């Protein structure tokens, strides 16, 4: 009796998963659980290893996958996943999750994964006591961000913005783009109604370049956790990162939400929640099909989600989630999830297929070397044209 769970929740990302696995083993003492993590932030490495496994005809029993175009445009369109519609009926999940989330996991009459959480992409992290020590406020717009960072440089803080490796630069970019475009024109990139070469979308790169000039110059070789660490250390004032950062700071670093660290929407994005969702499905050919199905039933349940998510920094995907199980951050995110305008993340798989996502890092490289907004815009448009962005 075995179950092989594939994810990128290695190292200090693992507590939430490990808690779920312990729950699973209580319920199913027969099963030996193989925790098959591929180490690498945002699944860049996991994507590559999964590709080798799937094309080699050696699927894991289940794998971490983002709800939306990431899921649909890769293993679903390739006819490598089982339709979970019957399981959804069995478990009452069509009423348990918000309709918009069901839509992201649904395609051509099937339902293809089970959401375990909701993460938010557009969060700015800072330390209220450090900000007071520097005599500044948290910025609510990109203009105020840039002005505050200049003030901070004058006060001796060389790199007021913490930043890491390539994907985290893309991560920062999607917050900047959302602020510059607003939610409607953000959405219009992904349905092809707004071109990347439109002046409105070229401006995202202009603002992004200015913001980049506030960042640590060693960013390229740092993990997302190391970039958060710079803020905790006061070697930076701000970091733009998903709320897995809240999980890190509380679960791993034991910081108190609200006093030892704080949060706001990314500048210019207040009232908009840029979401992503980690989900698990059922690959065809799974060696341990029933054990995988029982894992899906667990990760889709209130018991599972309210055990794991408080550790993770995400909120539950289930509508019936108990807010008393969440700290001050989780409760704040829960409120915003219900009240805000929702849009999807690019970097975390909601809005664009992997064909585009995987090439966007190249676009980002060419912005870092040229610092030319038009070149970056033109590059993103060329990729969009090559992959037929909007066709799925």
Ligand X SMILES: OC[C@H]1O[C@@H](O)[C@H](O)[C@@H](O)[C@H]1O
By the criterion CB under 6 A, which residues form the site for ligand X? 8-9, 13, 41-43, 119, 224, 242, 244, 276, 278, 348
Q: Which residues pair with 107 in a beta bridge?
A: 110
Which residues, including other chains, have CB under 8 Å from residue 250's CB and lie 6 or more apart? Answer: 256, 257, 313, 327, 329
Query: Minimum distance between the CB of residue 164 and ligand X, rounded to whole angstroms?
Result: 11
Tell me the binding residues for beta-D-galactose: 8-9, 13, 42, 278, 312
Which lies closer to ligand X via its Cβ, residue 130 or residue 348?
Answer: 348
Which lies closer to ligand X via its Cβ, residue 277 or residue 288?
Answer: 277
Which lies closer to ligand X via its Cβ, residue 174 or residue 278?
Answer: 278
DSSP string computed for 301-370: SHHHHHHHHHHHS-B-SSTT--GGGS-HHHHHHHHHHHHSEEEE-TTTTSSS-HHHHHHHHHHHHHHHHH
Which lies closer to ligand X via its Cβ, residue 4 or residue 278?
Answer: 278
For residue 84, give Cα distances in angstroms to 69, 147, 296, 320.
Answer: 17, 50, 10, 21
DSSP string computed for 186-207: HHHHHTTSS-TTSHHHHHHHHH
Query: Minimum distance between the CB of residue 13 and ligand X, rounded to whole angstroms?
Result: 5
Tell me the binding residues: 8-9, 13, 42, 278, 312
Query: Minimum distance between the CB of residue 312 and ligand X, rounded to whole angstroms?
Result: 7
Which lies closer to ligand X via its Cβ, residue 64 or residue 216?
Answer: 64
Rounded CA gap, 29 and 13, in Å?
25
Rounded CA gap, 254 and 62, in Å?
31
For residue 332, give Cα distances in angstroms to 114, 123, 263, 335.
Answer: 24, 12, 10, 5
Give the residue among 214, 221, 277, 218 at the shortest CA–CA distance from 240: 214
Rounded CA gap, 336 and 330, in Å?
10
Query: Minimum distance between the CB of residue 346 and ligand X, rounded to whole angstroms?
Result: 11
Query: Minimum distance between the CB of residue 41 and ligand X, rounded to whole angstroms?
Result: 4
Which lies closer to ligand X via its Cβ, residue 41 or residue 268?
Answer: 41
Query: Minimum distance between the CB of residue 63 and ligand X, rounded to whole angstroms?
Result: 12
């Amino acid at each position: 009796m075995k179950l092989e769970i594939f994810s990128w929740w290695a190292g200090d990302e693992g507590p939430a998963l490990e808690a779920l696995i312990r729950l699973y083993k209580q319920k199913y003492p027969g099963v030996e659980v193989i925790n098959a993590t591929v180490t690498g932030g945002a699944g860049v490495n996991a994507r590559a290893v999964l590709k080798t496994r799937m094309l080699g005809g050696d699927p894991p029993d289940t794998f971490q996958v983002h709800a939306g175009m990431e899921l649909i445009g890769t293993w679903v369109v390739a006819n490598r996943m089982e339709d979970l519609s019957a399981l959804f009926r069995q478990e009452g999940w069509l009423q348990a999750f918000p309709k918009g989330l069901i839509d992201l996991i649904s395609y051509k009459g099937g339902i293809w994964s089970v959401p375990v959480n909701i993460h938010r992409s557009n969060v700015m992290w800072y330390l209220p006591a450090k900000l007071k020590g520097w005599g500044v406020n948290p910025p609510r717009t990109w203009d105020k961000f840039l002005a505050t960072c200049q003030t901070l440089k004058q006060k001796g803080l060389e790199a007021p913005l913490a930043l890491g490796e390539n994907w985290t630069q893309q991560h920062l970019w999607e917050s900047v783009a959302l602020a510059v475009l607003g939610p409607d024109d953000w959405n219009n990139l992904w349905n092809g109604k707004l071109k990347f070469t439109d002046p409105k979308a070229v401006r995202a790169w202009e603002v992004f370049g200015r913001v980049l000039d506030c960042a640590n110059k060693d960013a390229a070789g740092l993990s997302w956790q190391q970039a958060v660490d710079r803020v905790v250390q006061g070697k930076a004032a701000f970091n733009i990162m998903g709320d897995w950062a809240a999980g890190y700071m509380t679960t791993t670093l034991k910081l108190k939400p609200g006093t030892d660290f704080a949060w706001a929407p990314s500048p210019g994005t207040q009232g908009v929640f840029m979401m992503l969702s980690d989900s698990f499905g059922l690959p065809k050919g799974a060696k341990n099909r029933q054990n995988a199905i029982n894992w899906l039933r667990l990760v889709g349940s209130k018991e599972g989600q309210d055990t794991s998510n408080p550790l993770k920094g995400s909120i539950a995907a289930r509508l019936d989630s108990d807010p008393s199980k969440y700290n001050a951050y989780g409760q704040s995110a829960m409120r915003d999830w219900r009240s805000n305008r929702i849009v999807g993340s690019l970097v975390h798989g909601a809005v664009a297929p992997e064909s585009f996502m995987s090439q966007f890092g190249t676009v980002m490289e060419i912005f870092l070397q040229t610092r030319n907004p038009q070149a970056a815009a033109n590059a993103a448009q060329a990729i969009a044209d090559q992959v037929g962005l909007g066709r799925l």
